[PDB]
Amino acid sequence: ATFEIVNRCSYTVWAAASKGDAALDAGGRQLNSGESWTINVEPGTNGGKIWARTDCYFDDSGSGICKTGDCGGLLRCKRFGRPPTTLAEFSLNQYGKDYIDISNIKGFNVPMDFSPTTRGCRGVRCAADIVGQCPAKLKAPGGGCNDACTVFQTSEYCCTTGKCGPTEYSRFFKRLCPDAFSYVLDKPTTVTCPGSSNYRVTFCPT
């Protein structure tokens, strides 16, 4: 499947794509304002994520630091990024279907649209100003709005026992972005697309 990743933000982002134990494609790249990066993702990929990282510094070996979404100090991510990170999540070719969603379970850093570029399903978006509205205790100094699990490390926020409910903090994410997952057991906002669809992830879509 092909994913086009577009930075419509006014600032540079460093896109990342990983399935947790491996890069997808090159695994990350700098995207200046307006730049588009097309990647290929192996059919059958399960548990892929795309995200943006902000305020990164990398040397010539691709080693450095980002203020949001840092994946162990690498330009080319192999692992998932440190919250807060708005996440585009997908599982491809799962019994003939693709499943996509946007999640705020690991917080929010950059607004995002995640849309098929082929026919037969609709996209999802979280484009509200979550950072500006972020509750004080969730605000990350680096930029971004952390989820409550990351900040407080309770069973309730992290849904560790597999039983948990919505919280004041999850409801904030949900009020601003109803189409994104706000906590682990949120009612699914997963969209089902045809197997082998193609997609575009747009940072700062509006």
Side-chain angles (χ1 to χ4, degrees), residues 1-41 43-75 77 79-118 120-186 188-206:
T2 77
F3 283 71
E4 188 178 52
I5 304 165
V6 176
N7 183 18
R8 190 170 302 151
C9 304
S10 58
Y11 48 83
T12 301
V13 304
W14 289 254
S18 175
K19 58 185 190 70
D21 58 357
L24 301 176
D25 198 287
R29 217 196 75 175
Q30 181 169 334
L31 291 181
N32 295 326
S33 181
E35 291 190 327
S36 300
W37 177 35
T38 292
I39 67 172
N40 290 286
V41 178
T45 297
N46 193 268
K49 298 193 204 290
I50 287 164
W51 68 104
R53 304 168 285 179
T54 56
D55 289 298
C56 298
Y57 299 84
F58 290 110
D59 69 18
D60 304 313
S61 72
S63 266
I65 186 77
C66 301
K67 290 207 203 330
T68 65
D70 190 61
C71 56
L74 299 182
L75 175 62
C77 300
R79 261 73 212 159
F80 294 140
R82 180 165 193 290
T85 56
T86 321
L87 294 169
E89 305 182 308
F90 50 87
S91 282
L92 307 178
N93 306 103
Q94 302 296 306
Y95 300 103
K97 302 293 195 190
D98 288 357
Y99 297 91
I100 67 165
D101 66 80
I102 290 176
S103 170
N104 288 324
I105 288 167
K106 303 272 171 197
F108 174 106
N109 60 342
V110 169
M112 167 195 289
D113 179 286
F114 185 12
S115 292
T117 57
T118 53
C121 53
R122 67 187 196 99
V124 284
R125 172 176 300 208
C126 173
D129 185 12
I130 286 180
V131 178
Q133 290 311 355
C134 183
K137 282 159 193 291
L138 299 185
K139 262 188 281 175
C145 189
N146 283 306
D147 65 287
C149 170
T150 296
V151 175
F152 290 110
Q153 298 277 271
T154 72
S155 302
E156 194 61 19
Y157 291 137
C158 305
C159 211
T160 304
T161 71
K163 290 172 302 155
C164 57
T167 68
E168 269 322 80
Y169 296 123
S170 72
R171 288 179 186 99
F172 158 76
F173 288 95
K174 195 62 171 191
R175 179 173 59 86
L176 267 58
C177 287
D179 290 333
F181 282 90
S182 73
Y183 72 110
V184 170
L185 291 180
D186 205 353
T189 41
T190 300
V191 169
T192 298
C193 288
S196 292
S197 296
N198 295 315
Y199 301 93
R200 185 180 282 124
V201 179
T202 306
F203 309 128
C204 303
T206 60

